């Protein structure tokens, strides 16, 4: 199974680590432009994959998670809630809402809540295909 050039294959999906920095809303749009989605994490193994991808490039990166709803709870850009077994991935002391932080990112060894208006790297996810989707 194939991924586009400069996407990474992991367990049937393709992952794009951005070369540029954009705000969270612009990162949502950027992933949609390439038939993809600002990354929604579905399994522990996927989180482990992504956390090490980001940790080693030492890059802070947007994921598809925000509390921009009425409840103020963390929900994925596909509308699914943050499951209890993922609360462990927040960094020590996070989320801390330090300056109106509604958008989740990879930060060091876990997750951070950041201001949505910050320019950050991002990761897109789409299914692997029989062809390279350029
Ligand atoms: N995309 C990037 N640069 N991510 C890293 C990052 C973290 N923060 C904040 C900062 O707050 C301190 C005042 Cl800037 O660091 C605290 C952790 O100590 C945070 O909880 C808080 O979200 N701002 N950028
Ligand atoms: Ca924070
Ligand atoms: Cl880019």
From Swiss-Prot:
Residue pairs linked by disulfide bridges in the UniProt entry: 3-14, 31-124, 103-116
Keyword match Cytoplasm: no
Keywords: Adaptive immunity, Calcium, Cell membrane, Disulfide bond, Endocytosis, Glycoprotein, Host cell receptor for virus entry, Host-virus interaction, Immunity, Innate immunity, Lectin, Mannose-binding, Membrane, Metal-binding, Receptor, Repeat, Secreted, Signal-anchor, Transmembrane, Transmembrane helix
Domain C-type lectin: start-end pairs: 9-125
Binding site residues for Ca(2+): 94, 96, 98, 101, 112-113
GO function term, MF aspect, one: pattern recognition receptor activity
Repeat among keywords: yes
The protein's role, per its UniProt record: Probable pathogen-recognition receptor involved in peripheral immune surveillance in liver. May mediate the endocytosis of pathogens which are subsequently degraded in lysosomal compartments. Is a receptor for ICAM3, probably by binding to mannose-like carbohydrates. (Microbial infection) Acts as an attachment receptor for Ebolavirus.
Quaternary data: Homotetramer.
Protein name (database record): C-type lectin domain family 4 member M
Organism in which the protein naturally occurs: Homo sapiens (Human)
Gene this protein is translated from: CLEC4M
Full protein segment contained here: 266 to 399 of 399
């Amino acid at each position: 199974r194939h991924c586009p050039k400069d996407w990474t294959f992991f367990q049937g999906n393709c992952y794009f680590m951005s070369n540029s920095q954009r705000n969270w809303h612009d990162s949502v749009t950027a992933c949609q432009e390439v038939r993809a989605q600002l990354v929604v994490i579905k399994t522990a193994e996927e989180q482990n994959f992504l956390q090490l991808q980001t940790s080693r490039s030492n890059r802070f990166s947007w994921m598809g998670l925000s509390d921009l709803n009425q409840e103020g709870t963390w929900q994925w850009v596909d509308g699914s809630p943050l499951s209890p077994s993922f609360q462990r991935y927040w960094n020590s002391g996070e989320p801390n809402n330090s300056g109106n932080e509604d958008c989740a990112e990879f930060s060091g060894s876990g997750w951070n809540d950041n201001r949505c208006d910050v320019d950050n790297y991002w990761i897109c996810k789409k299914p692997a295909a029989c062809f390279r989707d350029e």
